């Protein structure tokens, strides 16, 4: 009957990355940036013979919400921050607000990037994204970032309506205690399996969004003595078949076939698909490889050895997944 709880939580220990509130260096790295920005703002808007934009910051994506994980060797942290800027967003176009903080991120590391979603700044063995928004009292009520790239056209430049604080809220607030530390345990398991699997350029978006639709606790109570233990194995095991049960064969009329598409709202405005992104062919792939997750899932819970139960999980969450010897 080998269980895995033990080793399912030491590797967790393994792959956590501590969030900003407990990350000194992250908050440091964090802070430089935001200082680049305000200290490059200061020049690019002295030429232009106008006064700064002022910005204030937020932290947002995995670090803000404590579900990071470290990157592999070679790999890549991804600090995540917004910045509302105290201007009316029908006055300016977004790619162009985007344009002032890179040109303010000019010299500042490896340089900076404007992206479809964010203006995102390189350095060694980390990158910032930087998510651009309107401030809500001069824009008439609502939070909208920056959408559009340099080269983008113009129906694809827009002030995009979003709730940051409505999407972290409620990954903190789905559950609590021990719940709330098993459901962030499996997201990073399951980040993990992404960064094992699949190709250094399945969204940490998309399974965290997914994990909130669908991701149940697995723990027993005792009848007699009230005593509780989490058991991580059948939770993955219960999420990833419920994840592939929601793939939907989608008709692509360009390519004259169907592929198995996972659509997974966000749960606050604008309530978009997060996997929208992903192209047919890369959605069958990460379909298999979640079958194939799913199936090494069950091949661990009846494994009369704790070695080959632990091996099995090992080949999809890779080589720091505690294996003992047998
Ligand atoms: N496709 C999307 N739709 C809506 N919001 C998104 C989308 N992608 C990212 N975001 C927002 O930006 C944040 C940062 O995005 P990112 O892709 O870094 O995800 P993350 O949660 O930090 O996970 P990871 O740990 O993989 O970085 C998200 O947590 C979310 O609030
Ligand atoms: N709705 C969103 N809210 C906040 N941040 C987002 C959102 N969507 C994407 N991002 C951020 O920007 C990053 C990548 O998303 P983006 O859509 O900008 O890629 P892209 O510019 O289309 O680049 P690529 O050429 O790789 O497709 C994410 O890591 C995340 O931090
Ligand atoms: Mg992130
Ligand atoms: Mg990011």
Redesign the pocket.
Same mark, same amino acid.
């Given at each position: 009957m080998a269980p895995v709880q033990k080793q399912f939580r030491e590797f967790h220990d393994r792959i956590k990355l501590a969030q900003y509130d407990e990350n000194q260096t992250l908050r440091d790295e964090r802070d430089a940036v935001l200082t680049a920005v305000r200290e490059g703002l200061k020049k690019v808007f002295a030429d232009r013979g106008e006064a700064a934009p002022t910005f204030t910051p937020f932290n947002?994506?995995?670090?803000?919400?404590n579900?990071?994980?470290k990157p592999l060797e070679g790999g890549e942290y991804?600090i995540?921050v917004g910045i509302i800027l105290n201007i009316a967003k029908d006055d300016h176009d977004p790619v162009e607000v985007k344009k002032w903080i890179r040109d303010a991120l000019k010299d500042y590391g490896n340089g900076a990037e404007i992206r479809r979603?964010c203006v995102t700044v390189f350095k060694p063995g980390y990158h910032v994204?930087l998510?651009v928004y309107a401030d809500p009292e001069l824009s008439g009520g609502t939070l909208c970032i920056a959408k559009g790239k340099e080269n983008s056209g113009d129906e694809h430049r827009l002030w995009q309506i979003?709730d940051?604080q409505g999407?972290?809220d409620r990954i903190a607030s789905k559950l609590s205690g021990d719940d709330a530390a098993q459901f962030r345990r499996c997201i990073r398991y399951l980040?993990r399996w992404?960064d094992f699997r699949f190709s250094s350029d399945p /969204?940490?978006?998309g399974l965290?969004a997914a994990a909130y639709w669908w991701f149940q606790v697995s723990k027993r109570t005792d009848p007699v003595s009230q005593n509780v233990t989490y058991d991580d194995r059948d939770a993955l095991e219960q999420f990833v078949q419920t994840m592939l049960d929601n793939f939907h064969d989608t008709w692509d009329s360009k390519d004259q076939r169907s592929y198995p598409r996972l659509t997974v709202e /966000?749960p606050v405005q604008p309530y978009?698909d997060?996997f929208?992104?992903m192209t047919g062919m890369q959605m069958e792939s990460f379909k298999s490889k979640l079958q194939a997750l799913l199936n090494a899932l069950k091949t661990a819970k009846s494994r009369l050895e704790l070695h080959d139960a632990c091996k099995a999980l090992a080949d999809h969450f890779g080589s720091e997944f505690p294996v003992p010897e047998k």
């Open positions: 947002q994506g995995s670090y803000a919400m579900t990071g994980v991804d995540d979603s994204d998510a979003s940051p999407f972290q980040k992404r /969204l940490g978006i965290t /966000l978009n997060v929208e992104k």
